[PDB]
Design an enzyme around this catalytic site. Sequence first.
Site, PDB file in Angstrom:
ATOM      1  N   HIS A 181       0.891  -1.148   0.000  1.00 58.67           N
ATOM      2  CA  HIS A 181       0.000   0.000   0.000  1.00 58.67           C
ATOM      3  C   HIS A 181       0.940   1.212   0.000  1.00 58.67           C
ATOM      4  O   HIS A 181       2.051   1.141   0.525  1.00 58.67           O
ATOM      5  CB  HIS A 181      -0.967  -0.021   1.206  1.00 58.67           C
ATOM      6  CG  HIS A 181      -0.306  -0.042   2.550  1.00 58.67           C
ATOM      7  ND1 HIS A 181      -1.032  -0.092   3.723  1.00 58.67           N
ATOM      8  CD2 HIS A 181       0.997  -0.019   2.917  1.00 58.67           C
ATOM      9  CE1 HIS A 181      -0.204  -0.099   4.753  1.00 58.67           C
ATOM     10  NE2 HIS A 181       1.033  -0.054   4.291  1.00 58.67           N
TER      11      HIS A 181
ATOM     12  N   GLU B 179      -0.835  -0.245  -4.588  1.00 59.12           N
ATOM     13  CA  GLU B 179      -2.291  -0.339  -4.560  1.00 59.12           C
ATOM     14  C   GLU B 179      -2.951   1.020  -4.435  1.00 59.12           C
ATOM     15  O   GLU B 179      -2.376   1.951  -3.876  1.00 59.12           O
ATOM     16  CB  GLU B 179      -2.760  -1.175  -3.360  1.00 59.12           C
ATOM     17  CG  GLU B 179      -1.827  -2.292  -2.925  1.00 59.12           C
ATOM     18  CD  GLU B 179      -2.275  -2.974  -1.632  1.00 59.12           C
ATOM     19  OE1 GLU B 179      -2.765  -2.278  -0.710  1.00 59.12           O
ATOM     20  OE2 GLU B 179      -2.121  -4.209  -1.529  1.00 59.12           O
TER      21      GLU B 179
ATOM     22  N   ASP C 164      -7.477  -2.426  -6.007  1.00 59.71           N
ATOM     23  CA  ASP C 164      -8.241  -3.031  -4.927  1.00 59.71           C
ATOM     24  C   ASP C 164      -9.631  -2.415  -5.050  1.00 59.71           C
ATOM     25  O   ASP C 164      -9.808  -1.203  -4.902  1.00 59.71           O
ATOM     26  CB  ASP C 164      -7.640  -2.725  -3.552  1.00 59.71           C
ATOM     27  CG  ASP C 164      -8.389  -3.425  -2.428  1.00 59.71           C
ATOM     28  OD1 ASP C 164      -9.623  -3.233  -2.327  1.00 59.71           O
ATOM     29  OD2 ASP C 164      -7.754  -4.170  -1.650  1.00 59.71           O
TER      30      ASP C 164
ATOM     31  N   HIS D 189     -12.534  -5.071   4.264  1.00 61.46           N
ATOM     32  CA  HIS D 189     -12.829  -6.094   3.262  1.00 61.46           C
ATOM     33  C   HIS D 189     -13.977  -7.010   3.671  1.00 61.46           C
ATOM     34  O   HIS D 189     -14.201  -7.253   4.855  1.00 61.46           O
ATOM     35  CB  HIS D 189     -11.610  -6.982   2.999  1.00 61.46           C
ATOM     36  CG  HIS D 189     -10.354  -6.235   2.675  1.00 61.46           C
ATOM     37  ND1 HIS D 189      -9.143  -6.873   2.509  1.00 61.46           N
ATOM     38  CD2 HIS D 189     -10.107  -4.915   2.511  1.00 61.46           C
ATOM     39  CE1 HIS D 189      -8.205  -5.978   2.259  1.00 61.46           C
ATOM     40  NE2 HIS D 189      -8.764  -4.781   2.257  1.00 61.46           N
TER      41      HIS D 189
HETATM   42 MN   LIG Z   1      -7.547  -2.870   2.588  1.00 66.98          MN
END
Ligand SMILES: [Mn+2]
Length: 269
Positions: free
Chosen positions: A107, A138, A168, A218
């Site tokens: 990330h 990401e 994502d 998520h």
């Molecule tokens: Mn995440």
Amino acid sequence: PRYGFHLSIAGKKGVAGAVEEATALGLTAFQIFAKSPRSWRPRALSPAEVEAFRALREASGGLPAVIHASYLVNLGAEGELWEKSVASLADDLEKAALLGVEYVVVHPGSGRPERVKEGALKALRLAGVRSRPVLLVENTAGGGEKVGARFEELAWLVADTPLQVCLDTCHAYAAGYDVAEDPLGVLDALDRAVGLERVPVVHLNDSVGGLGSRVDHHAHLLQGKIGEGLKRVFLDPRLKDRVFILETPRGPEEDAWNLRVFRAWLEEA
Ligand SMILES: [Mn+2]
């Protein structure tokens, strides 16, 4: 399109255990960490384990693999956390090179986008990485000082570098991209800003948080707010040759649910 989960590397089987579990589950791709994400300490990787990982992978389909950097890594940090993060990511890249893993995903972190780019490039240099493995950044849920919420920012981040992108869907939804109702439009936006040819891996996470909520939570397939929107992303003709990884709680019940959805969708390609 290939699909898989994030598998564990803990235990006596080490990273080789993940390859075996991927075959046992019938996955066509998988993701692992290069060391426990809860600690900064690198995990020793013996030549015997490297040989086992490669041999096992090649014998059962040579499934695409991805190494995920720890959440601890913050390439945007102004403090010494930056050095720790850069060094940790370099370790991920070095381990990936040894294992023959083609991708490492991280990330962006939080802070100045310029600091993140500096960090990503430094990690690649420290690892002496060539065309392989490839580091993927990401997109994020954004908010606060999180970097990478907008696809245009990611395009700048990877410009003039060998970096590529990992989309994502949960992060995108949380950032304001309507993956639930306009998945095709979101991919059109990504292709215009970044270019889908530079998006080899997709973290096909559903989302607990709502559109533009900035919440990064998520959810299993069909259990979040995006729902069938993810089916449209998974089956978009432009991504038919990409790798899709779900990052949600693991277990026999959870895995069975997700695999049944992935496979039902795959039949609709
Ligand atoms: Mn995440």
